[PDB]
Design a protein that fits this description.
One of its GO terms (molecular function) is ATP binding. The chain has 541 residues and is α/β, with parallel strands linked by helices. It is 54% helix and 11% strand. The protein has 30 helices and 13 strands. A five-stranded parallel sheet has the order 2-4-6-1-7, sandwiched between helices. A three-stranded antiparallel sheet has the order 8-10-9. A three-stranded parallel sheet has the order 11-12-13, with no helix packed on it. A hairpin with a 6-residue loop joins strand 9 and strand 10. Helix 19 packs across helix 23. The longest helix is centred in the C-terminal third of the chain and has 18 residues. The N and C termini lie far apart (72 Å).
Length: 541
């Protein structure tokens, strides 16, 4: 009876240390989100009826650790004490599983649960369920919606069983909690009933500062690392994930020890990720094959909107044991012994970077001649707007492909990994230009084009993309000054210009920053002198 709970907590106490974070930090953040989540809130009535709880948010970002800590707390019987037994279901394992009964599907983890099917299954109000990586299942919406059933003994495909459980067609008195990416939220709200939805944010500014202090161990170095990260707004927002915090800490610590200047690295997040990739992998030869396979797997996962690898597909494709081992030693992909045979990427940003790099690599005919079949599209397919609507991940992939178009990054990557780059992929960017000169574009479209050009950090590409503009209209906040100033410095065919600088939400405090803003607006106001056909101007609101 209690032996299973004892085993569960014994196993939990080890996986509790398998992901970057200090015990006190994880406890603090778990208590915060306990204050947030009603299902475990100290001051929410635990009424005896079914609950369906959904946790959603960007990749990684702590939700899985929250679920694990809540299950461990249940095992310790330190809160509520309403459920006699509980189970944890891994969608990554179930994805490769074939048709089965629901009872055996949930029992397969425990060698001896099949001996008490009636009592264990009937007591629906005494059982708590946890599900992780729902979006990684790979099931179709129709399979999840169709052919429901009211009995566990029925043998059906895994999507049917999971949809029936979520749809509350069976075991109506049980409680369920899931964590997944936002794209699964729509399916769950269409599929489930009696739901409660909660969002996860991650590390706050004080959490980041404390993490830097603990990692570096020195006040001055910790503050230097923290302020270096604060320099980049996009990276700072991307730093909500503790995995990103660990990457930043490792990169900055290594650069400081080696004597490298960190500000240019922190200027662009593509540079930070490339530096991390360069530093992490060991030395050797013929790394090209390993990097190519990694990039292929990343692209295949991104197209299917997944971030997990399975041994079945790897073996059918023919991956080398050494390549998988090398990936593991570098912490690039991590395995959980609870789901042995399954692997996950370090973070989704790294996966998008690797997909953009995949598209950046020169393509060999040997892979094409192979009998294996892939659903990989082409570069223009990724750049097409319809696919952007279909797959949101491609806009970030577009950003990172724009960033990887830099020549210095390409040379560094070729030198460190031995890969080869093709110029046609770069011509694909000009073939579309993310055309914006026309009137069908929005303000956000122009802002995004400016952001991509700023991320490129290459003068010729920005010059060639900005020459198409005969008229320009810019709406500027304090954040939007830098990229607009960089890009607008290059346009020399405009004839008319409109400006709107929005009001920011203590004048000495603002002067302390105007002393820094001086060059930026100096560049932006040089357009009149440089150009020779700007007859008209307007400054509105």
């Amino acid at each position: 009876d209690n032996r299973c709970r004892y085993i569960l907590k014994t196993k939990f106490r080890e996986m509790w240390k398998s992901w970057p974070g200090d015990s006190k930090e994880v406890q603090v953040m778990a208590e915060r989100y306990k204050m947030l989540i009603p299902f475990s809130n100290p001051r929410v009535l635990p009424g005896p009826f079914s609950y369906t709880v959904v946790l959603y948010g960007p990749a990684g970002l702590g939700k899985t650790t929250l679920a694990q800590k809540l299950m461990l707390d249940w095992a310790e019987d330190n809160l509520i004490h309403k459920f006699k037994y509980a189970f944890y279901l891994s969608c990554r394992e179930l994805s490769r599983l074939g048709p089965c009964s629901f009872a055996e599907l949930v029992f397969r983890d425990w060698p001896e649960l099949q001996d008490d099917i009636p009592h264990i299954l009937a007591q629906a109000r005494k059982i708590l369920f946890v599900i992780d990586g729902f979006d990684e299942l790979g099931a179709a919406p129709g399979a999840l919606i169709e052919d429901i059933c009211g009995d566990w003994e029925k043998k059906k495909p895994v999507p049917v069983l999971l949809g029936s459980l979520l749809n509350r067609v069976m075991l109506p008195k049980a409680a369920l909690l899931v964590t997944t990416r936002p794209r699964a939220l729509r399916d769950l709200r269409i599929l489930a009933e009696e739901p409660i939805y909660i969002r996860v944010e991650g590390f706050l500014e004080e959490d980041r500062r404390a993490y830097f202090l603990r990692h570096f161990g020195d006040e001055d170095q910790a503050m230097r690392a923290f302020e270096l990260m604060r320099s980049n707004a996009a990276l700072f927002q991307l730093g909500s994930a503790p995995a990103v915090c660990w990457i930043v800490c490792t990169t900055l610590k290594l650069q400081m020890e080696k004597g490298e200047d960190p500000v240019p690295t922190c200027l662009t997040r593509t540079g930070l990720f490339l530096r991390f990739l360069c530093s992490r992998f060991p030395q050797g030869a013929q790394l090209r094959g390993a990097l190519r396979t990694l990039s292929l797997l990343a692209a295949q996962g991104l197209w299917a909107q997944t971030s997990v690898l399975h041994r079945e597909d790897l073996e059918r494709l023919g991956v080398q044991e050494s390549d998988l081992r090398l990936f593991l030693d570098g912490d690039i992909l991590r395995q959980d012994r609870v789901s042995k045979g399954c692997y996950s990427f370090i973070h989704l940003s790294f996966q998008q970077f690797l997909t953009a790099l995949f598209y950046t690599l020169e393509k060999e005919e040997e892979e094409d001649r192979d009998g294996h079949t892939w659903d990989i599209g082409d570069v223009q397919k990724l750049l097409s707007g319809v696919e952007r609507l279909r797959n949101p991940d491609l806009i970030q992939a577009g950003y990172y492909s724009f960033g990887l178009a830099n020549e210095k990054r390409a040379k560094e990557l070729e030198a460190t990994f031995g890969c080869r780059m093709s110029p046609d992929i770069k011509q694909e960017l000009l073939r579309c230009d993310i055309s914006c000169k026309g009137g069908h574009s929005t303000v956000t479209d122009l802002q995004e084009l400016l952001g991509c050009l700023y991320e490129s950090q290459e003068e010729e590409l920005v010059k060639e993309v900005m020459a198409q503009f005969k008229e320009i209209s810019l709406h500027l906040n304090a954040v939007d000054v830098v990229p607009s100033s960089f890009c607008v410095k290059h346009c020399r065919n405009l004839q008319k210009m409109s400006l709107q600088v929005i009001k920011e939400n203590a004048e000495v405090e603002r002067s302390q920053d105007d002393q820094h803003m001086l060059p930026f607006w100096t560049d932006l106001c040089s357009i009149f002198g440089s150009n020779k056909d700007l007859m008209g101007l307007a400054i509105n609101d």
